[PDB]
């Protein structure tokens, strides 16, 4: 007879119907991914259309209940999710042109190819050939050519489309209750109505700024070391005071520095820990890899896997006539159906990937009890953070020796630990300033702070001031450099990776303190610690029911994201960097540029 009582029954009915419809959409997607055929494509399209129609109908129904009249703080969250207004609030033609812009951008990025001038002999796409050249080639001229060619091929085409896109998304946000699309994206972290645990949209900006200000010294030392090594590699193209050039970073954009490990490895005599030959010599396969990962997740305290999981999941690529996508993915089909789609091979990387995916599935099992609208991670970062913490925990030499992959007679030294920490640094620390800079530029563009005539100028100035990266050839307003990245082209939130990077280290610090570990944080194994598993489950079982601040409190004892876990993790490598760069000018100057 009241708003709350009416809303409860509607939410129950919607949850029950959505369970079945989402299950048939997810099963259609799984069938298509495992076995690609025209029938499967039709089935997936039909299931997706049905699910979208159901979501639209229920969203239009749910607007009747005002959110000022609901005082459960859970029905309020479910109704907010339903009333998020995924259906366009703008006009039909405006929605059509927005979809047109998105489709055109995605198609341009996916089908972008580069050939030789007036020469159709070779035409390289992005992933197959251009990424390979950027990752492996050591030719400065070739790298500059590839970088400039990709930018000229994609940004010139994508600039006006992205301008129309930012105008349209700002209009959409103003049509909704948000200010700009940056505000819309920042709303994922907004928590209101819970005094003592609230998070505001504006607080994310300040939190990220403070975290990066804390990270700055370690990144500066890493940049100095990488710059010194790249000066050793390319003699005169790098200035001892200048910023690192963009095309030499390792990948087409500079998101990850992992490709620089071979050139800038500190100690090459002692090889990094490899277990592929050992696994072959002990006759291991993917099924027993997943069995060992299941044993690890049991030992930490998480529940065992399902017989249905083992029967339905395809952990090996069928090959032959069958063709399937080989990108590893953990599927929560719903109603007890948990599956992994991974063309697993006998590699240490695949072992860690299997641990990552089983962490995903354990999280999915943990939040299974909560309603459908709440069956997710507390924010966009915890889910991959939980994957990554297990990935790091299962890669320790102690764990490898315990499982038996390594010879127990082995002992570890300083060089191996330093090399491993520097590799993980190039993987993890390097992507933080880039993510921060890209998200800040995108937020400013959405807010309209950066004018159209100064988009790229401000972009490169902020990159030079923050990431210490300068373009080889100066680019005027015609080019649109950020549109090259897949996330920017397809309009995906990108601060998720920054948040996940902080969250995984906070989780690791908390769980290592729980597991009664003595020593540096990198050599932390939580294999047989039952207390750590329960301490993590306290958050894993919640899902989205509670605010992410409360979940972070439950895990680490702090209501705000902290970077001290990252600093403590990289303390030994920071000491090594201080020792190495004692004679090198740490930092960079904006004046220097490759072009003169």
């Amino acid at each position: 007879s009241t708003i709350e009582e009416q809303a409860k029954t509607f939410l129950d009915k919607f949850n029950h119907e959505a369970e079945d419809l989402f299950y048939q959409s997810s099963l259609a997607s799984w069938n298509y991914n495992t076995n690609i055929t025209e029938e499967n494509v039709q089935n997936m399209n039909n299931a997706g259309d049905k699910w979208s129609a159901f979501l639209k109908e229920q969203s239009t129904l749910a607007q009747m209940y005002p959110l000022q009249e609901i005082q459960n703080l859970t029905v309020k969250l479910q109704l907010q999710a339903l009333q998020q207004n995924g259906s366009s609030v703008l006009s039909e033609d405006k929605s059509k042109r927005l979809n047109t812009i998105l489709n055109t951008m995605s198609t341009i990025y996916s089908t972008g190819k580069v050939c030789n001038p007036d020469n159709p002999q070779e035409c390289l796409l992005l992933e197959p050939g251009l990424n390979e050249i950027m990752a492996n080639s050591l030719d400065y001229n070739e790298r500059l050519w590839a970088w400039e060619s990709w930018r000229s091929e994609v940004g010139k085409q994508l600039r006006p489309l992205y301008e129309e896109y930012v105008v349209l998304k700002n209009e959409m946000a103003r049509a909704n209750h948000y200010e700009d699309y940056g505000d819309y994206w920042r709303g994922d972290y907004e928590v209101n109505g819970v005094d003592g645990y609230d998070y505001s949209r504006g607080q994310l900006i300040e939190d990220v700024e403070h975290t990066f200000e804390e990270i700055k010294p370690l990144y500066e030392h890493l940049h100095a070391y990488v710059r010194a090594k790249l000066m050793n590699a390319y003699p005169s193209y790098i200035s001892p005071i200048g910023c690192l050039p963009a095309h030499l970073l390792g990948d087409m954009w500079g998101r990850f520095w992992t490709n620089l490990y071979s050139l800038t490895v500190p100690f090459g005599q002692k090889p990094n820990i490899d277990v592929t030959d050992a696994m072959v010599d002990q006759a291991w396969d993917a099924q027993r890899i997943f069995k060992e990962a299941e044993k690890f997740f049991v030992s930490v305290g998480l529940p065992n896997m399902t017989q249905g999981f083992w029967e339905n999941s395809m952990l090996t690529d069928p090959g032959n006539v069958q063709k399937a996508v080989c990108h590893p993915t953990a599927w929560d089909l719903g109603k007890g159906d948990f599956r992994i789609l991974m063309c697993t091979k006998v590699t240490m990387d695949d072992f860690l990937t299997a641990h990552h995916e089983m962490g995903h599935i354990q999280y999915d099992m943990a939040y299974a009890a909560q309603p459908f609208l709440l069956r997710n991670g507390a924010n966009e970062g915890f889910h991959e953070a939980v994957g990554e913490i297990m990935s790091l925990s299962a890669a320790t030499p102690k764990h490898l020796k315990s499982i038996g992959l390594l010879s127990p007679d082995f002992q570890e030294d300083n060089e191996t630990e330093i090399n491993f920490l520097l590799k993980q640094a190039l993987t993890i620390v390097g992507t933080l300033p880039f993510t921060y800079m890209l998200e800040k530029w995108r937020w400013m563009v959405f807010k309209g702070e950066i004018p159209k005539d100064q988009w790229m100028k401000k972009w490169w100035e902020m990159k030079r001031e923050i990431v210490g990266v300068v373009e080889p050839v100066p680019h005027d307003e015609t080019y649109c450099d950020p549109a090259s990245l897949f996330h920017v082209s397809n309009d995906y939130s990108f601060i998720r990776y920054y948040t996940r990077t902080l969250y995984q280290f906070q989780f690791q610090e908390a769980l290592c303190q729980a597991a009664k570990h003595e020593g540096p944080l990198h050599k932390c194994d939580i294999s047989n610690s039952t207390e750590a598993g329960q301490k993590l489950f306290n958050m894993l079982r919640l899902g989205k029911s509670e605010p992410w601040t409360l979940a972070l409190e439950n895990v680490v004892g702090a209501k705000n994201m902290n970077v001290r876990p990252l600093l403590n993790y990289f303390e030994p490598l920071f000491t090594w960097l201080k020792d190495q760069n004692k004679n090198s000018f740490v930092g960079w100057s904006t004046d220097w540029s490759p072009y003169a």
Binding site: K13, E17, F309, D337
Partner: protein
């Protein structure tokens, strides 16, 4: 003495019940890939059921303070909704014969 949707809206055993509850899995027989929607359970009733009662009346639930006027839609929902049983389902949602 159990509280829950099925217990209070489908079949309520008495507090002092004297009998045997026998349950065994029926996924091998009663599960269809397309979805066996024959089996249904009730999820909206005006009040709790008295012990050992069977309610087969299916009329438009009046959740709203406006009259349903015999039709459904806004604040007026069907009392019954079916399980969709498929063999791929995991334990916890597979059909059990009791």
């Amino acid at each position: 003495g159990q509280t829950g949707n099925i217990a209070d809206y489908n079949y309520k055993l008495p507090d002092d019940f004297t009998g045997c509850v026998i349950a065994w899995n029926s996924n091998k027989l009663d599960s269809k890939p397309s979805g066996n929607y024959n089996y249904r359970y009730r999820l909206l009733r005006k009040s709790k059921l008295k012990p050992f009662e069977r309610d087969i009346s299916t009329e438009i639930y009046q959740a709203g303070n406006k009259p349903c006027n015999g039709v459904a839609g806004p604040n007026c929902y069907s009392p019954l909704q079916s399980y969709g049983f498929r063999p791929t389902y995991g334990v916890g949602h597979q059909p059990y014969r009791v």
